[PDB]
Amino acid sequence: VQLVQSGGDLAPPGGSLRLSCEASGIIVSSNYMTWVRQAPGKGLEWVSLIFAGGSTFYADSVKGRFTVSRDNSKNTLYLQMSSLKPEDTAVYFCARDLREMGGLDFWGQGALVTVSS
Amino acid sequence: VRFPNITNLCPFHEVFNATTFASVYAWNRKRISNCVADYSVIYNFAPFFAFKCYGVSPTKLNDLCFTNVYADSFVIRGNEVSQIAPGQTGNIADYNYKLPDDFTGCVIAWNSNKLDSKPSGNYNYLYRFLRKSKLKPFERDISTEIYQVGNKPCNGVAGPNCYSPLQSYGFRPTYGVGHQPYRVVVLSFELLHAPATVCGP
Amino acid sequence: IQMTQSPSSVSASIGDTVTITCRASQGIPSWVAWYQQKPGKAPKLLIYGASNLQRGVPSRFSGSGSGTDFTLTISSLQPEDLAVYYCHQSDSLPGIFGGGTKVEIK
Ligand SMILES: *[C@@H]1O[C@H](CO)[C@@H](O)[C@H](O)[C@H]1NC(C)=O
Numbered sequence: 001v002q003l004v005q006s007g008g009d010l011a012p013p014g015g016s017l018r019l020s021c022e023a024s025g026i027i028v029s030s031n032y033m034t035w036v037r038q039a040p041g042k043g044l045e046w047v048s049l050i051f052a053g054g055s056t057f058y059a060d061s062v063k064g065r066f067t068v069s070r071d072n073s074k075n076t077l078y079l080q081m082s083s084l085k086p087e088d089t090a091v092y093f094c095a096r097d098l099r100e101m102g103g104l105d106f107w108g109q110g111a112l113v114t115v116s117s
Numbered sequence: 118v119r120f121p122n123i124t125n126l127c128p129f130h131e132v133f134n135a136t137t138f139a140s141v142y143a144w145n146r147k148r149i150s151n152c153v154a155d156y157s158v159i160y161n162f163a164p165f166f167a168f169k170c171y172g173v174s175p176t177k178l179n180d181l182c183f184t185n186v187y188a189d190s191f192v193i194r195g196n197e198v199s200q201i202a203p204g205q206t207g208n209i210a211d212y213n214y215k216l217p218d219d220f221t222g223c224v225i226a227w228n229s230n231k232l233d234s235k236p237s238g239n240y241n242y243l244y245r246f247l248r249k250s251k252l253k254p255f256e257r258d259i260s261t262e263i264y265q266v267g268n269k270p271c272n273g274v275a276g277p278n279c280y281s282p283l284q285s286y287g288f289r290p291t292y293g294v295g296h297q298p299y300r301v302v303v304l305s306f307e308l309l310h311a312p313a314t315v316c317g318p
Numbered sequence: 319i320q321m322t323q324s325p326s327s328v329s330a331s332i333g334d335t336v337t338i339t340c341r342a343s344q345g346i347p348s349w350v351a352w353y354q355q356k357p358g359k360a361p362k363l364l365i366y367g368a369s370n371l372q373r374g375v376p377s378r379f380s381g382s383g384s385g386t387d388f389t390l391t392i393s394s395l396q397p398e399d400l401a402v403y404y405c406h407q408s409d410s411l412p413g414i415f416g417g418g419t420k421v422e423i424k
Contacts, residue, residue, distance in 0.1 A: 001267075025267055025268055026266060026267050026268065026278070027265075027266065027267070027268060029249070030249055030264070030265060030266050031266050034413070036413065036415075043404070043415060043416075043417050043418055044353075044355075044361065044404055044406075044415040044418070045413075045415065046410075046412060046413020046414070046415060049411070049413070051206075051211065052247070052248060052249055052250075053211050053212070053248065053249075053250055053251040054251065055206040055207070055211055055251070056206075057206070057411055057412070059412065059413075060412075093360050093361070096266075098266075098280070098366075099246060099408050099409055100246060100284055100349050100367075100408050100409050101280055101284070101366065101367070102351070102363065102366045102372075102408075103351040103363060103366055103406060103408040104351070104353070104361070104363060104406070105363045105366075105372070107360035107361060107362070108360065109360060110360055207411065208411075286347075287347050287348070289345070289347075289385075291345045291385050292344075292345045292346065292347065292385075293342075293343075293344030293345050293346065294344070295319070295344070296345070296346060296347060
């Protein structure tokens, strides 16, 4: 029903950040979760997807650097950015996925990540 | 060099040249215990999209003896054949059919757009896309209980935040290669304490 | 795999019918979803399965398509439809988002 997003600040070209999404009305444990970023002035790009079981999938650019996690007690979905780059500056959205029967039906507000200075 | 007659051929022709295959979630397992195994009749079929053997040599199958041979059969899409392998993650390898990390056998997958595809849509083959935990190796799950995704309890009737965990490949002849029907047979070789009864000519 | 879309050069008057077309490189099942993103806001799901209207979405949004050709239609272009419209193959393990179409009021 609701996906409240938190986090997002300026990071160096090698900094590590963590964006969180707290879900109300749904169980993160029983749903597919997706992280989709939009670059400033560009289109929507798929970043990460965690399953209900726990299997994680990432894009070719973010593989080996980004980790999607899930905390069950707080019903929260995390995206951890270990190594950053100037190309990672974007607005990230956490979405409940209803693949083949709705897709990304519920979205978070978005967290903005800038990687410079 | 003289040996007894070759009499009891294993029924690989029934496993491969079957009229209809089983759905992915309810895959079809056939046991093979007492027969001489002719693996040369497999190559008599259509050219395979994937013939990958793990644990044993593809050309030394007739030189081995196993206690049991399990033949698992199902029909998946063209982009899910990569998931039928040891140590894979995805929609099929996690919720429908999971192979062990130390797997001994052979996976044979071939195109069947001619057979398992209809111009109006072949809405018969099913697969499971919703589950709460990854499947253990060689564990089936045949269930039609309504999956629950919200906090509200779901009594068993479909509705908001209540979805059936199974969907269908609407196989059509106008689809791309990644969504065509693909018949997959996985042969697993067991080496239990029982005497090895599946041999080769 | 690839999901090309009509360009963002769509400019129609209020009440006009607007069609946005999506073309897949190869034939795919009718599992294409449509999304509406307003400036500074998260995308909003409109139609899933290429023909099913999302709850709470006005009836003016109609989806129709098969094989390689899919279409979103706004029957009446009310002023609240100045947004970017995205197509998405809902059954792609690597997410496949087509380039959005910017609808403008003339
Ligand atoms: C073995 O097969 C051959 C060829 O058909 C036949 O002549 C022979 O009698 C068979 N032997 C036995 C023991 O059945």
